[PDB]
Every structure is written in C-alpha cells, then in structure tokens.
RNA sequence: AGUACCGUGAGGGAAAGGUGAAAAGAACCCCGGGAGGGGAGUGAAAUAGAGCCUGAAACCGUGGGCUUACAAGCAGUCACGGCCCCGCAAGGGGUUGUGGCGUGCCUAUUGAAGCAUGAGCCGGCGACUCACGGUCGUGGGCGAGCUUAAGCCGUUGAGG
RNA sequence: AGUGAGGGCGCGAGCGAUAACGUCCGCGUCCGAGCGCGGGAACAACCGAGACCGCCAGCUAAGGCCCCCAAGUCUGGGCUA
RNA sequence: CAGGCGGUAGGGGAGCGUUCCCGAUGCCGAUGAAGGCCGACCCGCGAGGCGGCUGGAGGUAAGGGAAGUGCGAAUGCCGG
C-alpha cells in the first residue's frame, strides 16, 4: 500500500491529443488519417536495388 | 499634517491612516513594526516648505502590520492571430498604519 | 491621486472679437471653451466658460478673403454641396464663420455638443450679449 | 396565493392570451369583466371562466371582501404543442405545433 | 458492428441535403459503433521468474522480520473448529488489530482459518509477495515445507 | 428567396410587437339598466332606447 | 471504457456562465461567443492596466500644466524650473498641491521660476 | 422494437426505462360543457402527483433594481460621476451618463475586418488505439540473461 | 520533428517597355511564427522598440508641442506669399 | 549575480481535474451519498475547501494502478 513505482517507470509519455491548450499533431494534408503514408523509404529503396 | 515624502515611487501625501503602500517587506517580517521614510515635501497645516530639504531632514515612521496579497483580477493573453492563455494579480504589502513627526 | 469634480460652478464671459483676428482668435475661444483650466478639469466638463462673444463679424481676415469656401452639402445627393466665400458667408452669417472656426476644434458629440451651447456670440454688435443679461466676465 | 386563476392543457395560445389578460388585468372583476365579455376575440370566454374559478376560490376558502377583488398580477403560459404536419410541394414536410395553452393570472384583493 | 449492419448509404451524398456522409448507423454518431474500440482483451505478463520469485521472498523477509508466525505447530480447535481455534488465536495473541495469511496444507487451519477479519483463509503453499506484504502478518504451519521451498527458489 | 440574416435580438422582436400593443374596448352604460353599452346598440336586458323589442323568453 | 465527461463539461461551462458577467443582450449568456466576447474583454482589462499608466500620465498633465501656467509658464518652463531645482523635484503630486494648497503651488512656484532663474 | 413506419419487391429499420416505502393514487364540497381550477383528506414530501424521481442549459413568461428620445458602437472596457444595495468602517456589491482608447473568434493563408470561410441557439455524442513485430530511450533483475506450447495446485481459486 | 510552395523593402544583375502591390536570382532586414507598443490619420513588412506579471512612479525613440489631443500660438537669423 | 521569460507548425518538462482497479471499503451518511442551485477563503492554473439552498441515496480515496475522457468547433451526430 505504498511503494509506487521508484524513479520513472510509469507512463512516461503518452501523451494524449497534440497541446494543453491547442492541438493538431504534425505538418500538412500530406500525412492526413488514412494517411500511414510513403513507409519506410523512397529514394533509400532506389539504393537498396 | 498632511505631508509629503513618498517611496518606491512616491507612495506619499497624508497623515495618521492605514495608508496602505508598496512592499517594502524588510521590518515587515515583524507585525506592527516601525520605520521612516526621508522626507521631500515639507508641509503641514500652514507651515508648508521644501522637497530638497525633504530629500534632507526630518523623517516619519510608521508602526504597521498585515499585508493585502492577491487582488483577484485576471489576464488572458490572446490573439486574434489565433491563441490564448491567462493568470491571477497577485500583489501587495505589509501594510502601514502612520506614526506622525 | 483623487481630486473629485466640485459642483454647479458657473461662470460666463465676453470675448471682444472685432478687430481680432480670424483663425488665432479661435484657437483662443477654442481651447477658452476648456474643461480644463479652473479645478476638476475634464471628461465630464469643468469651465469650458459658457463664453460669448460679439461683433462677431467686423473680424480680421486672415489676408485669404475669397478662396475660403465653406460648405453645407445637405444634399439630397446630386444636389449641390453649396460652396460658399467668406464674403457673403459673413455678409449674413458671420458668427457662424468664426462657429466653423469654433467647431472647428470642439470636439466630442454629446459634449463638445453641450460646449457650444455654453458656446454663443452673435455679430451682433454686443447689445446681444446684452440680451444675454447674466454675468460679464471679460477680454 | 389569494384568488388563485390558471389552468392547464387548453390548445389556445400564447401572445394573444398574454393581449387579453394585459388589458383586464389591473381593474377588478367588474371592469375586467365587462372588457373579457363585451370585447370581441378569441380568449373571451377562456379568460373570463378563468376569472370566474380565481373568484370562486377566492370568496370560497380565501373569501375577502368578494366586491373588491381585482386582478392583481397575473398573465400566461403555453405547454406543449401538438406537433401537426401540412403538405407544402414537391412533398416536403411543413411543420407546425399548434400552442396548448396554461394560463397564470392572480387575483389579487385591495 | 457495420460489416454486417453496416447500414449501406443513405444520404445522397450528393450535394444538396447540403449534409455529408454515405453510410447510415455510421460510426461517427447515432449509438453506432465508436472508435478505438472496446476490444476484448486480457494482460498476460511473463515476469521473470528470476526477480519475481527474488521479490516474494523479500517481501516474505520483511513483513516476517517485523511480525513472523513461522508456526510449524499450532492447535486449538476441534481438529481445528471455529470456536476453538478462536481460542488458539487469543494464545497464539491474534486479536483484532490484526490479518494474517494463514499458508500451509494444514486442512484444518484453512478449515477454521474464515472469518473476514483477522485471518486470511491460505492453506496451500501457494503464497504471492502481494497477499504478503498486504497481510499484517504471516501465518503458516507447514513451514518446513515453506521455508524450503523458499529456499529451492534460493538456488534451483 | 431573401432568408434575412439573424434576429436583431428578442429585442428588435419586441421593437416591432411592441409599436404593435393591444388596446381597450369602448363602453358607458345601458341608456336603459345598467352594465356597458358600446355607443349605439342595446342588448340581452334593457336593450333599447325606445321600444326594447329585445331580451327575455 | 466509460466516460460521460458530462458531469465535468456542464460544470466546465457553467463556470463559463459566470465568466460571463451579464454584459450586452446575447453575448450575455451566448454560451459560444459569450466564450468569445470574453476573450476579448480579456486581452481588453490587458490594454487597460497596461496604459491606465499614460492614461495618468496625461491625467496629471495637464491638471498641473493648468495650474503652472495659470500662474506664469507653462511646461517648458515649470518644469524645466522643478529641473534645475535640487534635493527637491516631485511630480505625482504636483497637481495634487496645485489643487489642495493654493499656496502649496503659489510658492512652489515662486522658488521654481527662481529654480531656473 | 425486428414491430411502428418507407420502399414494388428485394429491402430499411425508431422510439418509450423509474409515481411512492407501501397505493393509502385521491370519496367530498366549491367556477365549469368539459377539461381543468380552490379547498378537505394523503403524508414524513406531493415544487413525491400519474408520464408524475433527480428533474440543469435554451426560449417565452409575472414582479422588482438600475438604466433610456439631439443619438452614431461587436463589443467593450480603464476612469470617473449619479442612483440603489450588505455594510462597523474599511468598504465591498448592481447599475450605469461623461469621456480615452479598442476590426468579433474560428479553418485554410505572402496575406483577413472579413465581402473567403465555418458559425442558427441550448444540451448529450464527437476522433492518434490495439496486437504483435520491432526500435531508441530509460526504471528495474543477473552477465550468460529470460522463458513459450504443457502437466500439475488451484472461494481467495496461491503460484510452482 | 516540421515546413519541400510564401510575400514585402533596400541594394546588385535578369527580364518587362528599364511599366505594375509583375515575375528570376543574390547581400541584408524583413513579415510571417513573436514581431502583440510608438508610430506616420487610420496601413502584415516605412523611422523608432522587444511587451514574464505590477505602479492613480520619473528619464527617453521616432516623431511632436494654436486647437480638436499630452506638450513653447519658444528665441534667433532669413526667404516665399 | 546573472537574466533570460512575444512567440502556431514542432520538439522537451512539469501539473489538472475526469469515471473505474487495490482501493490493503477508513470509513463518510437520513444532523444526506450523489447531481444540482448560489458564494468578495485555496490554486501561478486545469482545479481546490469551505458556507448557504436542493435533493434522495450513495459515495469513495491517503498512496499507487487502469483508461471508449475532458472538446466552439467538422454546411457534424441525436434531441429539444
């Protein structure tokens, strides 16, 4: 009945929404909802052929 | 009896009242305490001469006590432009309760 | 600090005008018409002198005469804005020449407003203000 | 409170009731009378029953000088509607909800 | 929910009921179905048995250390009755001011070992470093058992 | 086809209903018995000024 | 799971209820740009504790200039003459005597048309 | 409630949970065609009264306070003066006439007062998760460290 | 992690008619994204100036002081009318 | 003493209520759970106590854990 987590451990960030006041994320459209956009790489895939 | 010395600024110009002023919190740290404030505006019912010699001579005290604190009061910065957040007034001073001279 | 506005402090004065001079004389009469010049000068009024002044007309020009045209556009649209030469302007209304002056810096509707009514000459030669029988404060 | 005048779910109306106990208000049951029953329009016989109960209850269980009572501060309230529904053109639905009248009048003695 | 009674469309998402959407009982509104839903779920946990075990012993160590009723022998009950193991309680000075977890095969310990107050009801050598160091006190009989097993987590 | 625009508050509402206001039916009393008589009429009761020819069966 | 905020919101805006003192007909209650209204009179009080200090500044200002100049100079003048004055130049004040001790700003000025020369 | 109701059929596919502790839920008298309205009794309450618990916002209403017919302003709001209010005073309330200064908020904009837009008003719903793979951190166990599938004990089901 | 397009002003070349609140590039400032205060009437980018919060305090920029509105209808010497 | 503290995108820190899980139910409570209605002590705030009225029974945390959560705002969704 007392020894909560040491140091840090508990939720560290989950950080939920985007600003205490405000909010929205990230940049433009280009990374909208259904928007898990160009993955892991473009032109690095180039390289990788 | 109204006089004129003033501090911090020129919190001055009165006689014996609870003239609350500024936070010079130094012989607050004691209730009721005692001090003087240099003059610089001599005058008092009919005698009235001299802020220089104000500035040199006589001074007056107070004994006080109390303090004020926050005065309510907020402000919420905000623009147009699109953005706001806001705070309470938080001020005061023991305050003073006039020792003549 | 403080300093509230006293009370009912009334007081008028005659304003000679004749022979004085068009635009300074306003500035005078002008600021005259204070709110700010006896205690408790300001917003809400203070002096302001409800002040009079005649032989309006007979005043100096300022060396203009002709080419100064007042207006009075009531107009009921494509009408005329009636443009109008200090001659005649005076001719027959003069205190109103030097009024344009007056209003001319009062500001403030509701009380620039209640100014000019403690604001009145007449080109009159004086025997108005005569009329205005009251006190006779001078200069 | 004294001469208690007002009822339930009766269809009449807002606005104009409120008209009629504006102007017979103020005077007592005789004035008010002959204005509620001589003067034309909808209401008349609403108000003036209205009326007749505050009275009754009055002079009834409250009683008071019955010849002095007046209406003393009083006026409406509308319930409900029924909720009716018209034809207005290429079909579309056209509402309406007709007022079911309350009425909220005192009558007062003095 | 929809895939089923995904309720096809139903607005003419046209152009001119001036609203949006095409699919009717959409999640987005009406009891329909609601976000990062509510999936059925459970938390398994695979810790370490290495610190896991560690730790029950601590905690054993400490809540042991400050109270240890390391019983080994005990008896007052008929085999162990209510009543009379009462009676043990107040020999073995177990009153109110007190929970203890009761933890050994000693049938009839768990047998009279109920009542909500004071005792806990844990006859097997089934232990947890919670209902330890929650448990004002430990209690148990078949301590040989435990200690050694306690032990066998000491060294496999 | 011209939807106004909002409302000019209860308050405008009012500014019209308002001018609009409900005024008060004319009466005196019966030239006959008694209770309100609108100018020239009679009614259930005396209902006359020369010949009742009205009221009562 | 749950979680019908409602509780807090209603409260959340009632609060807002209150933000909203009782001004003008509609951005009264108007919940919305009642909101708003206030944000607005918010960044206002702002404006207003901060220049009520000009607002003085003027205040003063003239009062006095009325004062000194009543008497035999305006601005450039008094004041410079407060200026050369020495172990003794105020000012939130100046008005305040000019007013309550006619003499207070009578001699005050005596010595100051002296204090420039 | 898969019934209302739309569709030709296929097919779509609501809403409405609570009076009270128990019915004692309203004899009876009074305006009235009636509803419904004042009384008596109910009772611990009936502002617990039949859609009748808790029963707020919105909007309309009855009375009271201040306020208003030479006025040009989102808003406001700093100041002050006149009212009225709790007040022991300190003073605290609400109300404003005089004046100073003040382009409303959201979205997408080089760029907004918008004449670009979203915005009818209230209320309840209303949107960066979960499973793993991983990956970097960092809070914790030993350096070789950790354990799936299972067999077993398992109110607590106890962990092994 | 975010912008991956932006505009304005000054100088330097394009271009364009040596036109445009044109568009091309560069050095700088800029303005957004702080650039919310002064300000020049009022005006995103022109001179002043960086606002963590107070003051019924005082010194100053730019740029101002007959009045409308704080501040000399300063003084001195001219020249237009 | 520095010394700085306009500042969306965006990145870091630190708190806030919010309905549940232990709550090692402590209980609190018909001299009211709760939601509500109003208020010139607490908070740098998100919030807090506390006082007064309603209101019919809950409610819950000392410390920590779990999340359909905090919303003008989307010609939004449902009802006025």
Redesign the pocket.
């Known amino acids: ?20 006041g ?10 909208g ?1 259904k928007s898990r956009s160009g993955g892991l790489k473009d032109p690095r895939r180039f390289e990788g052929g | 009896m109204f006089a004129i010395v003033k501090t ?4 001055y110009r009165v006689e014996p009242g ?1 003239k609350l002023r ?2 010079k919190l130094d012989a607050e740290p004691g209730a009721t305490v005692e001090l003087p404030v240099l003059l610089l505006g001599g005058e008092k019912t009919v005698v009235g001469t001299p802020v220089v010699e104000g500035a040199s001579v006589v001074a007056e005290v107070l004994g006080h006590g109390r303090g004020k ?2 005065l ?4 919420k ?9 806001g ?5 005061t001073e023991l305050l003073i309760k006039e020792i003549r001279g | ?5 006293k009370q009912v402090e009334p007081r008028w004065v005659l304003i000679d005008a004749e022979g004085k ?1 068009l ?6 009469i ?2 005259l018409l ?1 709110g ?1 010049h006896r205690p408790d000068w300001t ?3 203070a002096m302001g002198d409800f002040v009079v002044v005649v032989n309006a007309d007979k005043i100096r020009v300022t ?1 203009k005469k002709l080419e100064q045209k007042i207006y009075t556009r009531y107009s009921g649209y494509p009408g005329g804005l009636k443009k109008i030469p200090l001659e005649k302007m005076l001719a027959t209304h003069p205190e109103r020449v030097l009024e344009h002056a007056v209003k ?11 100014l000019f009514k403690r604001l009145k000459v007449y080109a009159g030669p004086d025997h108005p203000h005569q009329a205005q029988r009251p006190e006779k404060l001078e200069v | ?1 004294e001469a ?7 269809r009449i109306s ?1 606005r104009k009731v ?1 008209l009629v106990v ?1 102007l017979i ?1 103020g005077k007592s049951l005789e004035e008010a009378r002959n204005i509620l029953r001589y003067t034309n329009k909808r209401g008349a ?2 108000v003036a ?2 009326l ?7 002079v ?3 009683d008071m000088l019955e010849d002095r009572l007046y209406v003393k ?6 319930g409900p509607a029924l909720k009716r529904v018209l034809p207005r053109a290429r079909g579309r639905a056209d509402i309406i909800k007709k007022r079911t009248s ?1 009425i ?1 009048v005192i009558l007062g003695e003095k | 929910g929809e895939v089923a ?1 995904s ?2 469309k ?2 003419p998402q046209k ?1 001119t009921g ?4 095409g699919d ?2 959409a999640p ?4 329909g179905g ?6 059925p ?1 459970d ?2 946990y ?9 730790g ?1 012993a601590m905690a054993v160590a400490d809540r042991a250390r400050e109270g240890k009723l390391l019983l080994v022998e005990a008896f007052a009950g008929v085999n162990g009755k209510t009543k009379e193991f009462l009676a043990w309680a107040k020999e073995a000075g177990l009153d109110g001011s007190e ?1 203890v977890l009761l933890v050994t095969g000693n049938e009839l310990v ?1 047998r009279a070992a109920r009542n909500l107050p004071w005792v ?5 050598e ?3 470093v ?7 006190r430990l209690v148990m009989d078949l301590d040989a058992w435990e200690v050694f ?1 306690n032990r ?2 000491g060294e496999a | 086809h011209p939807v106004p625009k ?1 409302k000019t508050s ?1 308050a405008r ?2 500014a019209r ?1 308002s001018h609009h206001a409900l005024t008060p039916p004319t009466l005196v009393p019966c030239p006959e018995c008694k209770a309100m008589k609108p100018p020239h009429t009679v009614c259930p009761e005396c209902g006359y000024y020369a010949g009742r020819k009205v009221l009562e069966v | ?15 807002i ?2 933000l909203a ?4 007909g ?16 918010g ?11 000009r ?8 009062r006095i ?1 009325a004062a000194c ?1 009543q008497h035999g ?5 008094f ?1 410079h003459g407060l ?1 050369k004055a020495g172990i003794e130049v ?3 004040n100046l008005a305040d005597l000019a007013v309550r001790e006619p003499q207070v700003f009578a001699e005050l000025v005596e010595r100051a048309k002296a204090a420039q020369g």
């Open positions: 009945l007392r020894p909560n987590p040491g140091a840090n451990k508990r939720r560290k960030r989950v950080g939920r929404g985007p600003g205490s405000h909010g929205k994320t990230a940049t433009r459209g280009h990374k909802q | 911090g600024g020129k919190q609870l500024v936070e604190k926050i309510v009061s907020k402000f910065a905000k623009v147009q432009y699109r953005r706001k957040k705070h309470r007034q938080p001020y | 600090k403080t300093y509230v506005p001079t635009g300074r004389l306003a500035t005078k002008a600021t204070r700010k917003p809400n009024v060396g001319g810096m009062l500001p403030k509707g509701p009380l620039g407003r209640r | 409170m208690k005048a007002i009822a339930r779910y009766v807002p409120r504006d208000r016989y609403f029953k209205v007749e109960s505050a009275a009754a209850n009055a009834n269980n409250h501060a009083a006026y409406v309230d509308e309350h909220t | 009674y309720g096809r139903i607005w152009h001036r609203a949006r959407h009717i009982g987005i509104f009406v009891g609601v976000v990062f839903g509510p999936k779920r938390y398994s695979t810790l370490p048995k290495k610190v896991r075990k560690k029950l929970s768990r806990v009801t844990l006859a097997p089934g232990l947890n919670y209902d330890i160091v929650r448990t004002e097993q066998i987590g | 909002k209860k509402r009012d209903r | 799971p749950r979680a019908k905020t409602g509780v807090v919101r209603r409260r959340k805006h009632k609060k209820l209150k003192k009782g001004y003008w509609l951005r009264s209650k108007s919940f919305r740009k009642a909101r708003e209204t206030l944000f607005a009179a960044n206002y009080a702002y404006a207003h504790r901060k220049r009520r200090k607002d003085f500044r003027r205040l003063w200002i003239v200039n100049r100079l305006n601005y450039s003048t004041i200026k105020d000012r939130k």
